Design an enzyme around this catalytic site. Sequence first.
Site, PDB file in Angstrom:
ATOM      1  N   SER A  13     -77.789  97.126  44.628  1.00 44.69           N
ATOM      2  CA  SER A  13     -77.733  98.322  45.497  1.00 44.69           C
ATOM      3  C   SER A  13     -76.330  98.412  46.092  1.00 44.69           C
ATOM      4  O   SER A  13     -75.350  98.414  45.328  1.00 44.69           O
ATOM      5  CB  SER A  13     -78.870  98.261  46.498  1.00 44.69           C
ATOM      6  OG  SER A  13     -80.111  98.256  45.826  1.00 44.69           O
ATOM      7  N   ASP A  38     -82.978 106.294  39.368  1.00 44.65           N
ATOM      8  CA  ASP A  38     -82.923 105.387  40.512  1.00 44.65           C
ATOM      9  C   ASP A  38     -83.464 106.073  41.770  1.00 44.65           C
ATOM     10  O   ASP A  38     -83.112 107.220  42.066  1.00 44.65           O
ATOM     11  CB  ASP A  38     -81.480 104.922  40.728  1.00 44.65           C
ATOM     12  CG  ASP A  38     -81.351 103.962  41.880  1.00 44.65           C
ATOM     13  OD1 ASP A  38     -81.480 102.741  41.650  1.00 44.65           O
ATOM     14  OD2 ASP A  38     -81.158 104.435  43.022  1.00 44.65           O
ATOM     15  N   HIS A  63     -85.918 100.856  41.866  1.00 48.52           N
ATOM     16  CA  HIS A  63     -84.665 100.545  42.559  1.00 48.52           C
ATOM     17  C   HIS A  63     -84.505  99.037  42.732  1.00 48.52           C
ATOM     18  O   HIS A  63     -85.368  98.399  43.346  1.00 48.52           O
ATOM     19  CB  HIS A  63     -84.609 101.233  43.933  1.00 48.52           C
ATOM     20  CG  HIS A  63     -83.280 101.111  44.614  1.00 48.52           C
ATOM     21  ND1 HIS A  63     -82.099 101.501  44.017  1.00 48.52           N
ATOM     22  CD2 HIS A  63     -82.942 100.633  45.836  1.00 48.52           C
ATOM     23  CE1 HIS A  63     -81.094 101.276  44.844  1.00 48.52           C
ATOM     24  NE2 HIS A  63     -81.578 100.748  45.955  1.00 48.52           N
TER      25      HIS A  63
END
EC number: 3.1.1.98
Length: 340
Positions: free
Chosen positions: A145, A242, A286
């Site tokens: 991330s 995503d 994610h």
Amino acid sequence: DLRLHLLLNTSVTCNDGSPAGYYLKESRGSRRWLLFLEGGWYCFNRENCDSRYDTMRRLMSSRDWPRTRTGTGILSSQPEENPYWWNANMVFIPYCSSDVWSGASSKSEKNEYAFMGALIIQEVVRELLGRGLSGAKVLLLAGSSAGGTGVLLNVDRVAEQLEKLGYPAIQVRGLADSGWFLDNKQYRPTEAIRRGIRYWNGVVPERCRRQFQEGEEWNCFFGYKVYPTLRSPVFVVQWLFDEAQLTVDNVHVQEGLRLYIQNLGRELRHTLKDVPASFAPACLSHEIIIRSHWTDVQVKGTSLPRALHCWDRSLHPLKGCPVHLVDSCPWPHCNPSCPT
Ligand SMILES: *[C@@H]1O[C@H](CO)[C@@H](O)[C@H](O)[C@H]1NC(C)=O
Ligand SMILES: CC(=O)Nc1ccc2nsnc2c1
Ligand SMILES: CC(=O)Nc1ccc2nsnc2c1
């Protein structure tokens, strides 16, 4: 378990001035080192950083960190859970700078918070050299991330740091998971990053900075623009749909939204066409690499641990050992192995 070490240089700090640090598990029989960058959004002015300090304080401070953490996924030392690098030296670097790992600014009479992400990475590397990193053959800088974007921003600076310190034999590589974003049109912005860079004294890789020039360094936070400027080998992991990308796009199905979602996947696929080491499944999700069941998803019959092993072999095409794995089907979960 990985054990906490606070930085011996106590001037390299989390947002509130407490010392930054790292969690370490050594493997004395291995010359491979994995340094993983945690994610968790960011903050870009006094008011929203104050809010983050009330309810996300572990991401701004080391005062309440635990003495140990369990390694999971690619940070696991069990071969059943981590077929790729189970015997490596493992490092988890907590994200406590709220700056996408880009900052180089201390707390001062004019700054309520310190934003030192880029300096935290450099100091962790420096202190690890005395604990065995000096003998390494490969340093893999990984992250998820905001930490995946942090890999893209910092992998070449780690390579330059080790060269200038006198360690030319250590091969530095990057693994960027879920940090490959598009500055696309929303369904219903980039100002946050531009304002953040000024608030953080944020730094970007030098070749990318020279392309986009003053005032436009926000461009270097977007994978498809910064990746071509990098010299270190970088493997890119990215879900085609995503969830963080879709959240910023204000997506939470009729024809307009169907076309929007299909176009997002096609654009993502396009940006990875010239990325030879990549893993991009057609799923709505994610992050991937530190979850325990990261071994389950496959593209064209190949799992991510296998693709990473094939990448290792390529840095010594290979028969039956692919490294470029991008789904072509056009809708979330058209790949049966997507996580539920
Ligand atoms: C601690 O880190 C800061 C920032 O990188 C640096 O200016 C300082 O020289 C370091 N201290 C020592 C003793 O190296
Ligand atoms: C929720 C969110 O906005 N996450 C991020 C993190 C890093 C970025 N770099 S560029 N766009 C980014 C977006
Ligand atoms: C014009 C613009 O800035 N678009 C977007 C859309 C989604 C994003 N996710 S992260 N940064 C993003 C930027």
